[PDB]
Design a protein around this ligand. Structure first.
Ligand code: 32M
Ligand code: 32M
Lengths: 100, 28
């Protein structure tokens, strides 16, 4: 079965690829776009204001082959801030499609 | 039924799953 160390190595590469994108991807059309980020789980691109942002289930997941068309979601508000969880500075995310 | 090797594989599998859960929490 899939080991911790195999999963850590894949995560490190996912992170490396994400950091490359964060650095190299060109600026968004306006500063009202929400900002790209790596949140330790997924690599988020800039977001259009007032829209859902979707990215593929992270490929380092042990069960990635069982969620090949799954997406995780954030919502980018019209103010250029990611939608936040109540009582929290943390962003709302829906990762239900990527669960084992 | 279940064998010891099922338990040992379960435990290895859980090490990776706990790592994922830790990432989902923000790796804090
Ligand atoms: C971007 C995706 C948004 C996901 C939203 C997740 C849910 C957040 O919900 C917060 C709830 O806001 C509405 C108020 O809660 C519902 C109250 O309706 C009544 C509850 O059902 C029976 C008990 O009634 C209690 C009311 O006295
Ligand atoms: C970024 C560097 C990380 C490299 C090595 C991975 C460590 C990260 O671990 C964070 C927490 O995840 C714990 C990993 O699994 C161990 C949890 O237990 C799962 C099955 O092992 C049995 C241990 O029993 C004791 C648990 O109370």
């Amino acid at each position: 079965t899939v080991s911790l160390w195999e999963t850590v190595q894949k995560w490190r590469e996912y992170r490396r690829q994400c950091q490359r994108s964060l650095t190299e991807d060109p600026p968004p059309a306006t500063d009202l776009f929400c900002n790209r980020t790596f949140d330790e789980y997924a690599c988020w691109p800039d977001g259009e204001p007032g829209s859902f942002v979707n990215v593929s289930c992270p490929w380092y997941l042990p069960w990635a082959s069982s969620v090949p068309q799954g997406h995780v979601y954030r919502f980018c508000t019209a103010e250029g801030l990611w939608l936040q969880k109540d009582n929290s500075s943390l962003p709302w995310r829906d990762l239900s499609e990527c669960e084992e | 039924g279940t064998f010891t090797s099922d338990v040992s594989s379960y435990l290895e599998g859980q090490a990776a799953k706990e790592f994922i859960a830790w990432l989902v929490r923000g790796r804090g």
